[PDB]
Design a protein around this ligand. Structure first.
Ligand SMILES: Nc1nc2c(ncn2[C@@H]2O[C@@H]3COP(=O)(O)O[C@H]4[C@@H](O)[C@H](n5cnc6c(=O)[nH]c(N)nc65)O[C@@H]4COP(=O)(O)O[C@H]3[C@H]2O)c(=O)[nH]1
Ligand SMILES: Nc1nc2c(ncn2[C@@H]2O[C@@H]3COP(=O)(O)O[C@H]4[C@@H](O)[C@H](n5cnc6c(=O)[nH]c(N)nc65)O[C@@H]4COP(=O)(O)O[C@H]3[C@H]2O)c(=O)[nH]1
Ligand SMILES: [Mg+2]
Length: 301
């Protein structure tokens, strides 16, 4: 395992962050062994995305096996961020603090509320948790530009965004810009939907309709490497990411994901990523209108 500053904290996080999310086929002992295997492969950053009693017991026990200060524990909190309130903080005392046997969270990661502001009562409660040294930072998950009024909030120390070799320019730039302004950046979706083929399949993300995937055929035809392993290896070279989020269900999946950290991308790949992005942007150019006359016609409905 390699480690990286979770910037401006002096806390080092593993380049892999293991996500634990509800899974009814696992018991306490399985979650416990899942985290023991992570811990043995040098993973020290976890994101709990779930409140199944089985998961909190098992994760709880395994975290206890080592000293709290060696761990970076993020609690993922979903839902319309505009409807968070005291009920949220109650749920959080029960699940995240009592459930996991913790007296601080390194990070609480909420959804982008698409607003400069968080609800009064919730922000007050976070301020209280921080005064009590129970919450080191608030993080925001986004697929777009977070309101600068929110980023300027003293509470907000981190952002979570998808980054993968499908990622546009606008994305690549948002996360370097964030990281150069001393926000930690967690990388999501290293192995995105667009780059899997040989069912149903949802496409409800505002970034989805605009998405080239021509040129990634080398993902399949690289001797000694799976497409998943290349996509991850690539995310691990982006210097603006504090860490890359991964999800894994069994020991050998953890071990294989850890292996990728210490292997380097195959020899020709960086070159081919350029070939594919240079074709991506010859197509976005060759399929563009004059940006004035376009916008000006659009105005005149
Ligand atoms: N382009 C695209 N890909 C899609 C879409 N829906 C699912 N995928 C792909 O399928 C994975 C798992 O989807 P899931 O089962 O909902 O699993 C998701 C879901 O349970 C949750 N999640 C992620 N984003 C959102 C979100 O905006 N809202 C909600 N409510 N849950 C989300 O986190 C899990 C992991 O997200 P990922 O790690 O990215 O992994 C996602 C992503 O790779 C979509 O509309 N567009
Ligand atoms: N189950 C599932 N649903 C998905 C997934 N991807 C997108 N969606 C759905 O699509 C809606 C809009 O997603 P977006 O356009 O990325 O817009 C998202 C995005 O910018 C942000 N967001 C929410 N969850 C996440 C997350 O896990 N990671 C990041 N990076 N942004 C998130 O909040 C916006 C609104 O989130 P929602 O209201 O949840 O609404 C989400 C959710 O209902 C997925 O993988 N799984
Ligand atoms: Mg701030």
């Amino acid at each position: 395992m390699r480690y990286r500053p979770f910037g401006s904290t002096g806390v080092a996080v593993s380049a892999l962050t293991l996500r634990l999310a509800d899974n009814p086929r696992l018991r306490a002992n399985d979650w416990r062994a899942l985290v023991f295997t992570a811990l043995e492969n040098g993973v020290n950053s976890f994101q709990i995305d779930g409140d199944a009693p089985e998961l909190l017991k098992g994760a709880g026990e395994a975290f206890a096996s080592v000293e709290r200060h060696l761990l970076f524990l993020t609690w993922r909190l979903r839902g319309d961020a505009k409807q968070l309130g005291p009920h949220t903080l109650d749920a959080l005392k029960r699940s995240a603090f009592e459930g996991l046997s913790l007296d601080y969270l390194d990070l609480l990661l909420i959804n982008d509320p698409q607003s400069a502001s968080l609800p009064m009562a919730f922000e007050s409660g976070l301020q209280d948790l921080q005064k009590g040294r129970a919450l080191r930072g608030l993080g925001v998950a986004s697929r777009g530009d977070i309101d600068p009024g929110l980023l300027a909030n003293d509470l907000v120390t981190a952002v979570s965004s998808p980054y993968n070799l499908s990622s546009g320019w606008a994305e690549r730039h948002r996360i370097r810009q964030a990281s150069q302004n001393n926000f930690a950046v967690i990388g999501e979706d290293f192995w995105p939907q667009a780059l899997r083929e040989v069912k149903p399949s949802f496409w409800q993300r505002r970034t989805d309709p605009l998405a080239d995937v021509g040129g990634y055929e080398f993902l399949t035809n690289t001797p000694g490497w799976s497409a998943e392993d290349i996509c991850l290896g690539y995310a691990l070279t982006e210097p603006s990411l504090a860490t890359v989020r991964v999800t894994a269900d069994n020991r050998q999946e953890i071990e294989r994901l850890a292996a990728v950290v210490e292997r380097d991308l195959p020899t020709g790949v960086c070159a081919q990523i350029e070939m594919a992005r240079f074709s991506a942007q010859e197509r976005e150019k060759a399929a563009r209108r004059p940006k004035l006359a376009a916008a000006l016609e659009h105005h005149h409905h």
